[PDB]
Design a protein around this nucleic acid. Structure first.
Lengths: 106, 102, 105, 106, 99, 102, 105, 99
DNA sequence: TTTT
DNA sequence: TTTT
DNA sequence: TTTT
DNA sequence: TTTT
DNA sequence: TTT
DNA sequence: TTTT
């Protein structure tokens, strides 16, 4: 039984080849930049394209799966959760989607 | 153009960490900024910056208080800005399109 | 890695008290009838009824904590099982198999 | 100043599907010219396969039938709907479909 | 027990085109027909028949056939490209006579 | 001799008070929203209510008489014919030929 | 308003040719015998055919039209109302008084 | 599933007396009613309802009640003492609504 | 069968 | 949007 | 009935 | 940075 | 900061 | 008396 719902659903294209690093533990961490492309038509008739860039991160086996199958430009589906991680010269924060499910859409 | 070119969907259920803040633009449009905690159990919390425009923002600021359980559906949006050290810094919101008070 | 996406999200109210049955192997199975209420103006209130099934430990938590009228959140997958009637006419029923649940009262 | 309803949802009924069509879309028209497109969609997992009746109205259903074919990969967002009928034994019967509100050809 | 309402349509006219038959995922027949009723102008009705009735309709009726239907009025709604709520009314058939 | 049959029989309750108008000629047009309530019992013992909503229209003296003896909630009998009119959109409605207040 | 509802819907076949008469005032009165047929399968597997017979009468022009276009065996649609007319012998016959008629052959 | 005839009666009127309910030797209920329908003349219809439908008529309907019936026409015959075949037409109720 |  |  |  |  |  |  859950005590909250924190769910993100993305379909888009990667902007660069996935990056793989490992934690101090030896666990795989795959960082990916994803563009979601929305395009509507304004009251003047223009097609306005609007892109949003997301930082998607996949851990363990799923990240390994991401690093191998996905490439720059790949169309991909992600289900995940929002989290804001800190990092460092001083402290700065980033909001990223931690993937729970990935589907290669070619 | 009825086909979608992407999907950018957020779904949140949690509680407000403080009372909503409501402001108006010069033209009078309402903007309601809120901080939403989502809980997961390990006892861990996640904090989200949610923003609601228009009537949806007025209804939030009137019906919700600190601790209110609430459902949001929205989309992710990142804004950028430049600090005093001339670095480009980013900030991510959930822009709300739907709300249930629960 | 996923070979498809089959996701349902429901926020609604239980139509009746959940029923908890057990399979031959002892696995708990909780069947629930959930109403989702939508409102639009021309004030039109059109409910949709969903059969929601919860297996194992989660089924037991629904049977124990949920009651008729409970506001509840479900996340699940769409699936259509078959069953039988008076004769041997196979009958079909689409239902949401629950993967997460949050009591909202 | 004054409006007909509040802007708060009264419930959530949300379906998300990615799969492949089992057959070419079937497009028909009501007496009034309104298009109705019925499609059968397979979602696969591990091999297991669920079949969904998806229906799309208006220009969305015309778009479905002009772009999608048998085996096409497609994303749908819609709502769950059950409609009923009576068989010749006078037993009330149910059939559940997904009414599509968004479609992405993949 | 006792009925709590009455919703009844009686139609005699001629089909505008050949019936169309489809099946749901589970194997249920759904047959859609457009029926014309004539008066002393002409009214068109969308008629749907589920299950075996649908199958029998699709087997026995063709374009131009004179047919009798008994059914009930049903309206469905949907949202268009502009997010307006729209409505579509059909006669869900319960009896059928080929004439 | 009739060339076709196009008959609708309804017993229901109005969902709102009747709406009376007049043509240019002074001819009443009475538009009503009628709910026909069906109720069956399902396998699990729930008694299920399914409501259908109909647009009924009455002309002339019958329209005047509907606006006169019927309110929101009134249970009423209607006999009429199916019609689809334009306004470019379409609505299927029941043009009443008989009415009886119950 | 109507004050009452008295309505009969019939589809069936005439058992004989329509009989036409005129009243002292000159009004056409056409009398018809109509068979409605009903088939069902019983629990023993038999296909049970039954038949009800109705006295249908049309007045005025419709009676003359019935008398002209309908023969024995003709399949016809009738809309009308129930009436019980008395006649000395004192007897009563319940008949359907046609209001609408459609020739289905 | 295709009909071969239509025998449909629709009545709205007022009872003439209280419903008379009896039971067969097997315990089956049969309710016999006298229904008045008015045109402003008054027509009278023997309505008969079986099973629980007849019981619900007997429990809810009284001498002047306004009631709706759906049913089918049926004529029974008998032989008087002059050996004439006599006919009696009743409405067998299949649906009923208390108004 | 729910809820507001 | 009604009604039990 | 699709897909890998 | 992607992609139509 | 919520729960 | 009809009709399949």
């Amino acid at each position: 039984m859950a005590r909250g719902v924190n769910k993100v659903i993305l379909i888009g294209n990667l902007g660069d080849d996935p990056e793989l690093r490992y934690t101090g533990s030896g666990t795989a961490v795959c960082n990916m930049s994803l563009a979601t492309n929305e395009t509507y038509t304004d009251s003047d008739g223009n097609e306005v394209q609007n892109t949003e860039w997301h930082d998607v991160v996949a851990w363990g086996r799923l990240g390994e799966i991401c690093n191998e199958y996905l490439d720059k430009g790949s169309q991909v589906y992600f289900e995940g959760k929002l989290q804001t991680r800190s990092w460092e010269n001083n402290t700065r924060y980033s909001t990223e989607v931690k993937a729970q499910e990935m589907m290669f859409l070619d």
